[PDB]
Design a protein around this ligand. Structure first.
Ligand SMILES: OSC[C@@H](O)[C@H](O)CS
Ligand SMILES: [Cl-]
Ligand SMILES: [Cl-]
Ligand SMILES: [Mg+2]
Ligand SMILES: [Mg+2]
Ligand SMILES: [Mg+2]
Ligand SMILES: [Mg+2]
Ligand SMILES: [Mg+2]
Ligand SMILES: [Mg+2]
Lengths: 261, 264
């Protein structure tokens, strides 16, 4: 009853944002964080601060865990929003396409509302506990079963040793990459991909995905097959249920997926 | 009669725009066959689009000849005055697995010279076309030459499954990052738009790269063999389409250390 009303507000703040992003891009500035491949723009900072604003205006006891700010906070919180203000910043800057806003609301640690907004295609994926998962308002259904050898898979090949990359190439139908965790994960949710791996995501990179995986019967675990703490990064996979185990075993086999060189 | 290029372009665009009405039905009744091996796919979508275009050609340009993927091309010579090259669905695997990330490729060569080219991104309804003497366009929005992109500042795309893993690693190290759409025509347009620095296909057929000649010409792109030579539009060859400022570096990374084949 209440989720539906908070959802309307979120969907509304997301409508205002279509009208703000053009201006932000028009005046785009770009900085590096940890190294030259780690980008941040005023688009990331401003979407985030404006959400911060929204929360302060309508839910000021709700807390925010977000990418472009310090997050010294607890293990604990009743109302928690996790936000990736732009997921796919390299894609934003390099391509001005294939990036999204990721948002997720947790109530007493339980995911309740999730948003992955593909702003370049004006496609909003949302998940609402009690109602379902939607893409621009049409109900998404559990994808068909996909075994690994019938599935396209997606992952960052530069962060794994090449033997494991090759085992992954050999077991799956093919390999693609979108370059945004939220959008590669939505492909799994839609059934276009069998699995998306990210071996070092941050909580904002994967926060919306928990509710989508639950409502659509996906598997979403660490690369050791365990539950992921929504509050803390872990190496993670989101997968069709019929290829999940096969990917984990390949990832873990022959000394594991990490670089040795 | 005798037509201007603009008249020919008007015909093609409308035929392409008309295919929007046909495709939803073909996709809902989608059936797949195999070609060279179990994963070399062809669908009723590929076959109907190419059949309708051959019939469009017999209707409007009866002297014109068709070089296309889903038929034999034994009768195609180098003497041909009016030739179309078609990939009816470029990215069939994507059509089958995703119903996204595939396109229709067409190009017209007058006496061996590219005059008209089309990469129709149907799932998104974006028509990229290039018309000699007019320019290149994405939905009638004119495209211009992309900014210089050094490899180290550029995203690149290639099939990493078909190359020496060492070359792959070198390609990763030297570029800003890696991405893959999975249709040559679509990965090529990302280069034409300045979104990727380069796309490589080490074994394209003529129809995978036919439209791209004129786009590279109109937009100042480098489009060459992996040896840096001209490509024969009639015969496949290993190929790169690239921003100007990163083409040399990519080709040297490819040919380094005995080259990019898995056995070197
Ligand atoms: S597939 C949609 C394509 O046009 C996006 O830009 C890449 S995910
Ligand atoms: Cl996407
Ligand atoms: Cl594309
Ligand atoms: Mg970032
Ligand atoms: Mg981000
Ligand atoms: Mg992110
Ligand atoms: Mg084919
Ligand atoms: Mg084809
Ligand atoms: Mg093709």
């Amino acid at each position: 009853k209440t989720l539906q009303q908070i959802d309307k507000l979120i969907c509304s703040w997301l409508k205002q944002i279509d009208n703000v992003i053009p201006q932000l891009i028009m005046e785009m500035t770009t900085e590096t964080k940890r190294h030259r491949f780690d980008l941040v723009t005023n688009v990331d900072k401003q979407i985030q601060q404006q959400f911060q604003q929204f929360l302060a205006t309508y839910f000021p006891e709700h807390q925010l865990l977000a990418e472009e700010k310090s997050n010294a906070m607890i293990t604990e919180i009743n109302h928690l929003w996790i936000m990736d203000p732009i997921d796919g910043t390299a894609n934003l800057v390099k391509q001005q396409e294939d990036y999204c806003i990721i948002l997720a609301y947790f109530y007493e640690g339980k995911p309740m509302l999730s948003y992955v907004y593909d702003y370049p295609h004006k496609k909003l994926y949302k998940a609402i506990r009690g109602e379902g998962a939607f893409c621009n308002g049409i109900k998404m259904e559990e994808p068909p079963s996909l075994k690994l050898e019938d599935a396209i898979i997606s992952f960052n090949a530069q962060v794994m040793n090449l033997d494991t990359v090759q085992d992954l190439f050999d077991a799956s139908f093919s390999y693609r990459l979108v370059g945004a965790c939220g959008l590669d994960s939505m492909r799994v949710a839609k059934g276009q991909f069998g699995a998306h791996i990210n071996t070092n995501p941050k909580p904002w990179d994967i926060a919306a995905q928990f509710l989508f995986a639950e409502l659509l019967n996906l598997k979403m675990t660490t690369l050791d097959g365990k539950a992921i703490d929504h509050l803390k990064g872990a190496p993670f996979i989101i997968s069709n249920k019929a290829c999940h185990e096969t990917v984990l075993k390949i990832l873990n086999a022959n000394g594991g997926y990490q670089k040795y060189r």
